[PDB]
Design a binder for this molecule. Structure first.
Ligand SMILES: CCn1c(-c2cc(N3CCN(C4CC4)CC3)cnc2[C@H](C)OC)c2c3cc(ccc31)-c1csc(n1)C[C@H](NC(=O)[C@H]1[C@@H]3COC[C@@H]31)C(=O)N1CCC[C@H](N1)C(=O)OCC(C)(C)C2
Ligand SMILES: Nc1nc2c(ncn2[C@@H]2O[C@H](COP(=O)(O)OP(=O)(O)NP(=O)(O)O)[C@@H](O)[C@H]2O)c(=O)[nH]1
Ligand SMILES: [Mg+2]
Lengths: 168, 163
């Protein structure tokens, strides 16, 4: 059977974790705000010629439960670090998520991809170069996405799978 | 005189029982009046026929989205949303009735009924009432919930009003 990859989508409340995931899985854009408790999805895809099963965990952005992320970070094989390009605090929040995964997994070599979402919106507050500079300093790819237009949606998840394959 | 309201609860259309609530108009009058009027439906809209979309055993039952019926909607009698009135009352244990929200000052019509103490919600959700009769109906709703809140049967407010 095809190889399964456990992907985890993390980031601050409202950055678009669920809209991105639901675009990937269901080809539909969720316009409404339905803040997540915890949801899981499955999709089979072809990446670099190889069929793979994506098992995606869509996590909560609620800061009150930040101490409850340890278990899913232990289980996850790769992480999408999502911020919104029109929300500077969401970009600042990224470093804490990254540090948390590094601490929980006790490793500098965790498959991660930096995702700058809501690229369709005109109210940008985070420079593309700044995100690109941050991803460079982490050693990970950076992908600009729009859950609304689908720009980069497949690329974000596919690139994360490629980061897992190189690690494993 | 703190008003009293009732929900007649049905499970996939089959009667389950009546829950009644005391609304703390003495301490949270604007928030209590919103819930009261939505329970009578006197504004031409309200809770009647809406469902409990999120039930998480060990924690709470949440409902009140009568505009979209998907957990994202609801509206108050004062506009789509209204401000946090006060955080005088705390989430002290089972039966507390409190406002759901999407962050500061975003009360609409969604509410939750605690099935346990939820003290980490103190100061973020406006507590405005308590179950008065029929707490075991709320307990009975829990068996239709799950870890992430998705319900396995349709739990509806078949009827509601003021006592
Ligand atoms: C980390 C997992 N996790 C937990 C949680 C936490 C704990 N603890 C914390 C407390 N510890 C003690 C101190 C030691 C023990 C372990 C255990 N297990 C769990 C769950 C079962 O693990 C899956 C929760 C929880 C809550 C959220 C997200 C994730 C959550 C969440 C998302 S959105 C929101 N919270 C507020 C939400 N907003 C909307 O729905 C907006 C929609 C749009 O605009 C109108 C409408 C809202 O108002 N309410 C009304 C209030 C109860 C609240 N929902 C809700 O469902 O809380 C669920 C729960 C279980 C009580 C808390
Ligand atoms: N214009 C635009 N809006 C987006 C985009 N992605 C998400 N949104 C919108 O942003 C809001 C929040 O999206 P959501 O996916 O719920 O974000 P989240 O990170 O899952 N929130 P939570 O942490 O509470 O689960 C919604 O109104 C959604 O429609 C995007 O790429 N473009
Ligand atoms: Mg979400």
């Amino acid at each position: 059977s095809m190889t399964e990859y456990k992907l985890v989508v993390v980031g601050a409340d409202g950055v678009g974790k669920s809209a991105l995931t639901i675009q990937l899985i269901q080809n539909h854009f969720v316009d409404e705000y339905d803040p997540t408790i915890e949801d899981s999805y499955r999709k089979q895809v072809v990446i670099d010629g190889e069929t793979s099963l994506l098992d995606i965990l869509d996590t909560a952005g609620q800061e009150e439960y930040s101490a409850m992320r340890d278990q899913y970070m232990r289980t996850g094989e790769g992480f999408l670090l999502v911020f919104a390009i029109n929300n500077t605090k969401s970009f600042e929040d990224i470093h804490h998520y990254r540090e948390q995964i590094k601490r929980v997994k006790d490793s500098e070599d965790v498959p991660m991809v930096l995702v700058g979402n809501k690229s369709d919106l005109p109210s940008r507050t985070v420079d593309t170069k700044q995100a690109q500079d941050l991803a460079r300093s982490y050693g990970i790819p950076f992908i600009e996405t729009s859950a609304k237009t689908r720009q980069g949606v497949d690329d974000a998840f596919y690139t994360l799978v490629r980061e897992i394959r190189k690690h494993k | 005189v703190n008003p009293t309201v009732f929900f007649d609860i049905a499970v996939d259309g089959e009667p389950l029982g009546r829950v009644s609530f005391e609304l703390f108009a003495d301490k949270v009058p604007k928030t209590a009046e919103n819930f009261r009027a939505l329970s009578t439906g006197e504004k031409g809209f309200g809770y009647k026929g809406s469902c409990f979309h999120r039930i998480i055993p060990g924690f709470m039952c949440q409902g009140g989205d009568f505009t979209r019926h998907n957990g994202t909607g609801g509206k108050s009698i004062y506009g789509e949303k209204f401000e946090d009135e006060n955080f005088i009352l705390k989430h002290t244990g089972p039966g507390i009735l409190s406002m759901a929200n999407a962050g500061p000052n975003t009360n609409g019509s969604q509410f939750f009924i605690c099935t346990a103490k939820t003290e980490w919600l103190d100061g973020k959700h406006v507590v405005f009432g308590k179950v008065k009769e029929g707490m075991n109906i709320v307990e009975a709703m829990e068996r239709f919930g799950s870890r992430n809140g998705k319900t396995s049967k349709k739990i509806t407010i078949a009827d509601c009003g003021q006592l």
